[PDB]
């Protein structure tokens, strides 16, 4: 499914680290004046037109580069663009709502109506451009047994290290909101997590913890986990809700590799129903992945 | 006791800032330096050294720092922003640092409530009596002024870091809204602004 495509970096932009999807290079007309400046990165599939390439290179406002990627994942596309322009970080993903470019690459990764860029709130929670990690509570951080418990109390230390370095903490466990909330309360994690996934929740013990799963779209022509194999789109949307419109890389840590929708990194852990000292090794793996990303963009 | 140890650490940080000031080797106190408009070079050097000191603290592993910066000491009201005595603009690739010298001078000249307030302290009269029977300096006001300037430049340096890391757009947006750094430490620990809290209430 190797597909050729073009990417352009604006040589003088107002909004940085933001990418816009176009069905073709000609879509720039839809931006016209004082809109292109808000998308310093432009991505669009390539139609093998040398005259189009000539036009693009003549467009001195843009630095062009061509790369190929499978037509099924933002991961390869984003890796290619980020290595091309040496940008470890990505801004909010924008699309031309007037002319939605239907690329199978996306299929529920993330997006935004282009015109909403200016409305974005730059202020965020963590200084710099933190990483993001999503944890599937069930048997990943706790014990699958009924009387759930932290499989390895080193979970607290690992989360504190994540926070100290700077990295958004997200939970997505495919259980009842009440189940996950009470699991947090029992294992005394609670405030560790920036985002929680399973009007948010009201029990007189919590104010707002589980953003209501209002977004429903079934599947994008893929037979898999009934609910979903997790949702980069939903998690990044909640990041933006939490004022996080930038991130360095995203890692999904869970007890089930099947979900693994599209994440810059993934970590699998045992479906262990009883406590065991292994989360230190899992934390070692996660920090190794983070360091690997840091190596990819060490220069 | 413990809190006293953190107090000692904070005072040590202030003392390090004092070492930086001595390295600068200014004849006059910062109050007089700021009062003297002609000392534009001294003011710029003070600001730059404070910024570098804060950068080293905020990034202990990083010793590098911008070794050249355009500076402009502003005096007119229209050349200053309330609540941001220090600003970091860009003149099309040129990094300009604007300074509100009148505001700095005003803050420094403000009388401090050193004696006025009474606060808990080591007051064991038995120890004092036992001691009695067994038997270049900085004032509290100067220390307060110096802390005020350090914290001002800390705010300025945080805005500068937003500017460099994110860009001029986000720097302006931060100037408008400061909510980005309610969390602060999340590096930051070495910044005194992360050591206390200040609030305003309707009354």
């Amino acid at each position: 499914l190797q597909s050729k495509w073009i990417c352009l970096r604006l040589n003088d932009a107002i909004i940085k680290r933001h990418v816009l999807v176009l069905s073709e290079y000609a879509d720039l007309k839809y931006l016209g004046f004082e809109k292109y400046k808000f998308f310093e990165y432009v991505i669009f599939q390539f139609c093998n037109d040398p005259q189009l390439c000539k036009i693009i290179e003549n467009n001195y406002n843009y630095c062009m580069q061509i790369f190929k990627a499978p037509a099924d994942d933002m991961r390869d596309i984003r890796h290619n663009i980020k290595r091309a322009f040496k940008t470890p970080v990505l801004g909010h993903m924008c699309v031309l709502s007037n002319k939605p470019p239907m690329y199978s690459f996306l299929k529920e990764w993330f997006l935004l109506p282009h015109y909403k860029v200016v409305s974005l709130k730059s202020e965020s929670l963590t200084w710099g451009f933190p990483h993001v990690v999503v944890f599937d509570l069930d048997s990943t951080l706790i014990t699958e047994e009924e009387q759930v418990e932290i499989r390895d109390p080193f979970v607290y230390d690992s989360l504190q290290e994540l926070h100290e370095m700077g990295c958004v903490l997200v939970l997505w466990s495919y259980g009842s909101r009440d189940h996950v909330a009470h699991s947090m309360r029992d294992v005394d994690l609670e405030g560790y997590f920036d985002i929680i996934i399973s009007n948010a929740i009201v029990d007189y013990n919590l104010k707002k913890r589980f953003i209501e799963n209002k977004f429903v779209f079934d599947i994008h022509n893929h037979r898999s986990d009934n609910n979903i194999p997790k949702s980069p789109k939903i998690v990044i949307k909640y990041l933006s809700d939490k004022n996080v419109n930038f991130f360095k890389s995203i890692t999904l840590v869970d007890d089930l590799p099947t979900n693994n929708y599209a994440y810059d990194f993934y970590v699998k852990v045992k479906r262990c129903p009883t406590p065991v000292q292994d989360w230190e090794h899992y934390h070692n793996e996660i920090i190794q992945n983070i360091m690997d990303y840091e190596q990819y963009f060490i220069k | 006791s413990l809190e006293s140890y953190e107090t000692l650490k904070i005072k040590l940080a202030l003392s390090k800032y004092m070492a930086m000031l001595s390295t600068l080797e200014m004849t006059q106190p910062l109050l007089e330096i700021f009062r003297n408009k002609a000392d534009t070079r001294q003011i710029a050097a003070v600001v730059f050294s404070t910024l570098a000191f804060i950068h080293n603290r905020f990034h202990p592993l990083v010793t590098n720092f911008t070794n050249k910066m355009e500076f402009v000491v502003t005096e007119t009201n229209d050349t200053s922003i309330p609540g941001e005595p220090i600003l970091f603009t860009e003149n099309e690739g040129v990094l300009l640092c604007s300074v509100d010298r009148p505001s700095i001078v005003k803050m420094l000249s403000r009388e401090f409530d050193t004696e006025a307030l009474v606060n808990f302290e080591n007051d064991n009269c038995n120890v004092r009596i036992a001691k009695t029977f067994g038997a270049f300096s900085i004032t509290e006001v100067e220390a307060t002024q110096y802390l005020t300037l350090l914290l001002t430049v800390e705010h300025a340096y945080l805005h500068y870091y937003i500017f460099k890391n994110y860009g001029v757009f986000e720097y302006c947006k931060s100037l408008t809204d400061h909510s980005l750094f309610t969390n602060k430490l999340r590096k930051t620990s070495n910044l005194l602004l992360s050591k206390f809290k200040f609030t305003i209430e309707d009354f």
Binding site: - | H178, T182, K184, L193, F196, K197
Partner: peptide
């Protein structure tokens, strides 16, 4: 002096410190 409105909550945010859980 500038006759500009003041954002009390934003000033509080300037000097706002979050507290961790440990």
């Amino acid at each position: 002096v500038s006759n500009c409105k003041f954002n009390i909550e934003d000033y509080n945010n300037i000097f706002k410190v979050m507290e961790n859980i440990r």
